[PDB]
Amino acid sequence: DFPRSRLRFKEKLGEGQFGEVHLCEVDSPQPLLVAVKILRPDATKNARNDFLKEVKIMSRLKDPNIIRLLGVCVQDDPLCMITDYMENGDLNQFLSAHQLEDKAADPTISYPMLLHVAAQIASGMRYLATLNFVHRDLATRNCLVGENFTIKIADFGMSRNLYAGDYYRVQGRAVLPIRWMAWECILMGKFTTASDVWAFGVTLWEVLMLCRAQPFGQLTDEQVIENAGEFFRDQGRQVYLSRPPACPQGLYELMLRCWSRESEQRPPFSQLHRFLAEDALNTV
């Protein structure tokens, strides 16, 4: 554990439904920067409950490419969660500020580095699958970036105003990231490792687009939901995300397998990782 007195709050990183995140300095660990989530000023009973469960969920997760809990605060202190500061923020903003390098002749990013980024996400999901842990909301907006393009999968929740358009809302219902969701998820509301594979396909599409466009960006929420119906009825009228310019055809055919109607035919994270780390290198 860790005493709240030993933290030096420095600035504000973001706001959540039941907490808020600050960049803090630690002088006497056991100039070290860390990210700390604490209760919001208007902390409710229900919010303290969700905060404590977040700590329990996060305490399961121990992998180089998954966010890790470095510690929590002593019991009689006001509640806190401490994790590594990821200095380049979320992956969506980060990739947005880069463009594909022009090998012929603003920071840039090469195709092999994009593969490297995608492969780390795949490895993190490989780990989650071994725990039978289902993420439920994989997307570039929920990945963090550290030094040297290191990537860690996290989960900000669905409340950030910046990504409001990524979630479909109906009064009294669960909030749904429908443009990342497998057809069975949209129709029946339930999430599996196989639907995480589907979301990974979309996330891989994002990375290869350098996050310059929303998935199915020219279609409405209602058209995206109706597309799930076309997967169900299986009469060849369903549509897919198109091949990104940075994406060679061999890699795109792997993306497409992530959107197979049958869950069993979607590739496991072990195979996705192997392709991204090895096979995709002869397509460079």
Ligand SMILES: O=C(NC[C@@H]1CCCC[C@H]1CCOc1cccnc1)c1cccc(OC(F)(F)F)c1
């Ligand atoms: O990520 C999760 N919760 C949010 C986390 C809470 C602790 C304080 C930091 C904050 C993220 C922002 O962190 C920053 C932000 C900016 C710069 N550096 C760090 C989470 C929650 C449940 C399950 C989970 O597992 C997996 F992701 F697998 F779903 C991950």
Ligand SMILES: [Cl-]
């Ligand atoms: Cl948060």
